């Protein structure tokens, strides 16, 4: 069926779109984490820092807080790289499946 390949090709185009959105989201969380880490490093070593979790605000040691954001930053960056890698595969599988249709159409002969 050639119409079954069009659908798969189209479902894959939406995935490419979805993944594109996840990437924009992760990038935003990276910028925000970076901005917070920059603020924390300019503050003195004994600055009083706080963490909000839901409806509560709690004072936390600055060195533990910094490490916590660093880990989140690093995990998000790895995630961004994993996303881009998935992105390329999808694009290749896409340009591919397009070819398989760009010729299966000239059906027989």
């Amino acid at each position: 069926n050639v119409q079954h390949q069009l659908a798969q090709f189209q479902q894959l185009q939406q995935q490419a779109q979805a993944i594109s959105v996840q990437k924009q989201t992760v990038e935003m969380q990276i910028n925000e984490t970076q901005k917070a880490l920059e603020e924390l490093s300019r503050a003195a070593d004994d600055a009083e820092v706080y963490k909000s979790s839901g409806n509560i605000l709690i004072r936390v040691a600055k060195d533990e807080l910094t490490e916590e954001l660093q880990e989140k930053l690093e995990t998000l960056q790895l995630r961004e790289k994993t996303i881009e890698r998935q992105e390329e595969r999808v694009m290749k599988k896409l340009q591919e499946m397009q070819v398989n249709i760009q010729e299966a159409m000239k059906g027989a002969g």
């Binding site: 901005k35 917070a36 924390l40 600055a47 820092v49 706080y50 963490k51 909000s52 979790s53």
Partner: protein, 133 residues
């Protein structure tokens, strides 16, 4: 004939002019809040121990005594807040206002161009209309 092409795009522009006018308000709104924040921090300097009334809803207020007025806990994003002294706090606020002002300057330009090109398309849509009728 090609009149609808114009009478149509002058909308995607009229639908983008009003959007920017909206975003510019939000920015002005944020600047206002930062200005009120600056006034409050200025107003409390040197007032450790002074009484204050805190609005708690529907016209009701409770009592409290100001404490460590030269310090303010400020949110820096990603769930983090940092306690800063008066000068540092006012410094961050001015930086943000400047940034938002700068952002307002830029949004102004974008709105200009759009309004400008609309001006050159209308003289055409008006003369095409005179032709069809």
């Amino acid at each position: 004939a090609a009149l609808a092409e114009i009478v149509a795009q002058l909308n995607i522009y009229q639908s983008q002019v009003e959007l920017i006018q909206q975003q510019m308000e939000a920015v002005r709104a944020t600047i206002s809040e930062l200005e009120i924040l600056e006034k409050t921090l200025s107003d409390i300097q040197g007032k450790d121990g002074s009484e204050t009334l805190v609005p708690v809803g529907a016209g009701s207020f409770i009592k409290a005594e100001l404490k460590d007025t030269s310090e303010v806990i400020m949110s820096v994003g990603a769930g983090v807040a940092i306690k800063k002294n008066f000068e540092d706090a006012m410094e961050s606020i001015k930086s943000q206002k400047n940034e938002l002002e700068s952002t307002l300057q830029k949004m102004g330009e974008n709105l200009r161009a759009i309004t400008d090109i609309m001006m050159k398309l209308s003289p055409q849509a008006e003369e095409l209309l005179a032709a069809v009728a």
